[PDB]
């Protein structure tokens, strides 16, 4: 019986929510995505919301709105996903690695601060795992610089920083791929609060197609989600608090639990919060524990557990090892060849949860 790290929580309402659009007839971009829009800004408290086919699209166009390119620098910490160093590169722009906490794994004001030259043009943030990264000091940044922020909120729907929800203002890119906690297979949407921007992200989504009848203004992708997808999202994000609970719910297990164990799930940040708890990572080092990552993570998988990686930072992979050579980041590397993360998902049972428990004390 493998019990992966994650499962969709799919029931009644994705599929009665799918057989609607399939009988109306209009299953691409329509009516589905502009209350997926709607339901995002209500959502967050922010006033504009973009509907796209994933997160990386968002990525992508939202610096691509920005004018960013040959010459320009972009900051990220490189522990994330590759793709927004993907996105950095693939525009013609350089990617400014840069560490994160030790324990929180989230890009600190000082590391970033350091990167600032006069070619940086956009700082992006990662609210880690579910918990969000210092808000107020990177926007500060942001302003003081005069350099636009543009939030990674993958992991974060259902996160909140000081009493207010991730993307209520600023600029937000959440996603809906299948293991993030609404889903719709694939897919994503960028929150933003300024209208000329998202007058282009919408323009860049879809061919760069626009009135002066639509006809292309400036070049663009074709990264729109189809009202298929998009109805699936919506009832997902229908259940929201509901599927956050039961994540939260087994967060403090695995909390509770890891006291008797000797792995180090990451650290809370210290400002005030809402954790959507995304990711249960802990950390494994070979001397504390007796076993290395990889050891745990093919032990766990002898026992029909699964568990999975976020991240083997950006920095260490080919592409990036040989165009960047000489770039140390301690704490990013320090974690990237120690976390991993345990099954969490919304349906995950006690016999599931448990199961895994009397795997660690095995291993441990
Ligand atoms: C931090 C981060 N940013 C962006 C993306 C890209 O999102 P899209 O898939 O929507 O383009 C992911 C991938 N998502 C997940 C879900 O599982 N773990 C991952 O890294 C991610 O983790």
Same mark, same amino acid.
């Given at each position: 019986?493998?019990?992966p790290?994650?499962?969709?929580?799919?029931?009644?309402?994705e599929?009665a929510?799918?057989?609607?659009?399939?009988?109306?007839?209009?299953?691409?971009?329509?009516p589905? #995505?502009?209350e997926?829009?709607?339901?995002?800004?209500?959502?967050?408290?922010?006033?504009?919301?973009?509907?796209?086919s994933?997160a990386?699209?968002?990525?992508?166009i939202?610096?691509?709105?920005?004018?960013?390119?040959e010459?320009?620098?972009?900051?990220?910490?490189?522990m994330?996903?590759?793709?927004?160093?993907?996105?950095?590169?693939?525009?013609?722009? #350089?990617?400014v690695?840069?560490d994160?906490?030790?324990?929180?794994l989230?890009?600190?004001?000082e590391?970033?601060?350091?990167?600032?030259?006069?070619?940086?043009?956009?700082?992006?943030p990662?609210?880690?795992?579910?918990?969000?990264?210092?808000?107020?000091?990177?926007?500060a940044?942001?302003?003081?610089?005069?350099?636009?922020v543009i939030?990674?909120?993958?992991?974060?729907?259902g996160?909140?920083?000081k009493?207010?929800?991730?993307?209520?203002?600023?600029?937000?890119?959440?996603?809906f791929?299948?293991?993030k #906690?609404?889903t719709?297979?694939?897919?994503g949407?960028?929150?933003?609060?300024?209208?000329?921007?998202?007058?282009k992200?919408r323009?860049?989504?879809?061919?760069?197609?626009?009135?002066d009848?639509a006809e292309?203004?400036?070049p663009?992708?074709?990264?729109?989600?189809?009202?298929? #997808?998009?109805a699936?999202?919506?009832?997902?994000?229908?259940?929201?608090?509901?599927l956050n609970?039961?994540?939260?719910?087994?967060?403090?297990?695995?909390?509770?639990?890891?006291?008797?164990?000797?792995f180090?799930?990451?650290?809370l940040?210290?400002?005030?919060?809402?954790?959507?708890?995304?990711?249960?990572?802990?950390?494994?080092?070979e001397?504390?524990?007796?076993?290395?990552?990889?050891?745990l993570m093919?032990?766990?998988?002898?026992?029909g557990i699964?568990?999975?990686?976020?991240?083997?930072?950006?920095?260490?992979?080919?592409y990036?090892?040989?165009?960047?050579?000489?770039?140390?980041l301690?704490?990013?590397?320090?974690?990237?060849?120690?976390?991993?993360?345990?099954?969490?998902?919304?349906?995950?049972?006690?016999?599931?949860?448990?199961?895994?428990?009397?795997?660690l004390?095995?291993?441990?």
């Amino acid at each position: 019986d493998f019990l992966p790290f994650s499962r969709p929580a799919m029931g009644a309402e994705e599929l009665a929510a799918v057989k609607t659009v399939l009988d109306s007839g209009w299953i691409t971009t329509g009516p589905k #995505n502009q209350e997926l829009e709607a339901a995002f800004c209500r959502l967050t408290g922010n006033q504009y919301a973009v509907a796209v086919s994933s997160a990386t699209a968002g990525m992508h166009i939202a610096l691509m709105a920005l004018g960013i390119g040959e010459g320009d620098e972009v900051i990220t910490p490189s522990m994330t996903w590759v793709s927004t160093l993907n996105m950095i590169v693939l525009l013609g722009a #350089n990617p400014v690695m840069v560490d994160v906490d030790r324990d929180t794994l989230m890009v600190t004001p000082e590391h970033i601060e350091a990167a600032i030259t006069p070619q940086t043009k956009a700082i992006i943030p990662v609210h880690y795992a579910g918990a969000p990264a210092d808000l107020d000091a990177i926007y500060a940044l942001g302003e003081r610089y005069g350099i636009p922020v543009i939030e990674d909120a993958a992991h974060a729907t259902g996160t909140s920083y000081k009493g207010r929800h991730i993307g209520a203002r600023g600029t937000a890119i959440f996603s809906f791929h299948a293991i993030k #906690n609404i889903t719709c297979a694939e897919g994503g949407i960028v929150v933003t609060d300024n209208p000329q921007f998202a007058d282009k992200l919408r323009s860049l989504k879809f061919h760069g197609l626009g009135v002066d009848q639509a006809e292309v203004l400036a070049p663009g992708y074709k990264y729109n989600l189809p009202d298929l #997808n998009a109805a699936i999202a919506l009832a997902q994000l229908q259940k929201l608090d509901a599927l956050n609970a039961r994540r939260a719910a087994i967060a403090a297990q695995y909390h509770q639990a890891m006291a008797d164990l000797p792995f180090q799930p990451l650290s809370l940040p210290s400002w005030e919060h809402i954790h959507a708890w995304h990711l249960f990572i802990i950390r494994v080092d070979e001397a504390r524990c007796g076993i290395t990552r990889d050891a745990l993570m093919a032990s766990l998988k002898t026992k029909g557990i699964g568990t999975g990686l976020h991240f083997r930072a950006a920095h260490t992979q080919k592409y990036y090892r040989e165009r960047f050579p000489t770039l140390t980041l301690p704490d990013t590397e320090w974690n990237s060849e120690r976390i991993c993360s345990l099954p969490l998902f919304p349906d995950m049972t006690e016999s599931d949860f448990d199961r895994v428990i009397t795997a660690l004390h095995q291993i441990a």
